[PDB]
Amino acid sequence: GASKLRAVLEKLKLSRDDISTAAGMVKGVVDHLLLRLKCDSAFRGVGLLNVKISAPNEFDVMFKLEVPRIQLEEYSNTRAYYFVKFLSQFLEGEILSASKMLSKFRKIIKEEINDIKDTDVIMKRKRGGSPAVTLLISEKISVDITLALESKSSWPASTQEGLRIQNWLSAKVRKQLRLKPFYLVPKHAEETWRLSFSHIEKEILNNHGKSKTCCENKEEKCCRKDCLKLMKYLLEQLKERFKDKKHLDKFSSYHVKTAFFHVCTQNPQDSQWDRKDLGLCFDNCVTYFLQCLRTEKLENYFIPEFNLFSSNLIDKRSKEFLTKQIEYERNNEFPVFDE
Numbered sequence: 001g002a003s004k005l006r007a008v009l010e011k012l013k014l015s016r017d018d019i020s021t022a023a024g025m026v027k028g029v030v031d032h033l034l035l036r037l038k039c040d041s042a043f044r045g046v047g048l049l050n051v052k053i054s055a056p057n058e059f060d061v062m063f064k065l066e067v068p069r070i071q072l073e074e075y076s077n078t079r080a081y082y083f084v085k086f087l088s089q090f091l092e093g094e095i096l097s098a099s100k101m102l103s104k105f106r107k108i109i110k111e112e113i114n115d116i117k118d119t120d121v122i123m124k125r126k127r128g129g130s131p132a133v134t135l136l137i138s139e140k141i142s143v144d145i146t147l148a149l150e151s152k153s154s155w156p157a158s159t160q161e162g163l164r165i166q167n168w169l170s171a172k173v174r175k176q177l178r179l180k181p182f183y184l185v186p187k188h189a190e191e192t193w194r195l196s197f198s199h200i201e202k203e204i205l206n207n208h209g210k211s212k213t214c215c216e217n218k219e220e221k222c223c224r225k226d227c228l229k230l231m232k233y234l235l236e237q238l239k240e241r242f243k244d245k246k247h248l249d250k251f252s253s254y255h256v257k258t259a260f261f262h263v264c265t266q267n268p269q270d271s272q273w274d275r276k277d278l279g280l281c282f283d284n285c286v287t288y289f290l291q292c293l294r295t296e297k298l299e300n301y302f303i304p305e306f307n308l309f310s311s312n313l314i315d316k317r318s319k320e321f322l323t324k325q326i327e328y329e330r331n332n333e334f335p336v337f338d339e
């Protein structure tokens, strides 16, 4: 039961030196990119947001951009995607073009990756939709660099009922977090940006307990992070197996992370994450995730009425597929976690 799950966690640790040198190799490139971008007029004020690492060999950095005051107009009744208006060059009328601002980004990075031949890097474009300009360092370490407009404005109205952390983290912490900037990434679904809160996701994962002193001492070790690790790992391991038909590629660790936050709201006390109960805690996350699949419904933690599992994004076939795989997995004490 747990023993099997502790074994997986111990295994996972064995590659703790592998990801640290691979990410140090990401760092050197990102530092290099920040310099060359602060030499351009458009991007002069860029910085790094802080918040990295998704799957093994897959990294994510965010390049924040301080911008004057933003006014948003919600695109359609899609609660996450917006237009932007008061960098002049990128105007299409009064609207700041995501597509245009994402092209001058991708441009600068392509030119300035050929030189510094020191490291062997290739610029890539991965997928449509995506706001990430995706590099591949020495054909093994791929990094997602995502540009991010910063708005020190009050969050948009579609986030009014999101971040329901009051019963787990304090109502006062939700106020602290919603006084913080939010971010727009040029993901279009069109010249449209969509909301991001990856910096808030980093804080509620690292400052995750009802007790302010969760995980700071031997009396208060919860298994929240471990559970999210096992969930992330369950998805990767399954995405490997069923790559004989590449039928699970729409699912990602964000889904696992999103669903885990939802479980943390349902189970707000550290006592529900006692590390002795790792097995039952892990069950909790897997049963909720299933429910999300089978009900075709998984709310963005910050944008409730944005359904990461609607038909728009993932079709019914792929979700029924993963429901069957995860259901079999749970019913049999997870043979994917064997040997």
Ligand SMILES: Nc1nc(=O)c2ncn([C@@H]3O[C@@H]4COP(=O)(O)O[C@H]5[C@@H](O)[C@H](n6cnc7c(N)ncnc76)O[C@@H]5COP(=O)(O)O[C@@H]3[C@@H]4O)c2[nH]1
Pocket: 060, 127, 128, 129, 130, 131, 132, 144, 146, 185, 187, 195, 196, 197, 198, 250, 251, 252, 253, 254, 255, 308, 313
């Ligand atoms: N590195 C990175 N940061 C991003 O913000 C992001 N947003 C999209 N993508 C990639 O673009 C493509 C389109 O996915 P879609 O947006 O339609 O659903 C996405 C998206 O709605 C959600 N999601 C992923 N990252 C974030 C994020 N930071 N904030 C909010 N939602 C996110 O989870 C779904 C699957 O994402 P990924 O399959 O892991 O990579 C996606 C995908 O390749 C991103 N990649």
Ligand SMILES: [Zn+2]
Pocket: 208, 209, 214, 215, 220, 221, 222, 223, 224
């Ligand atoms: Zn803890």
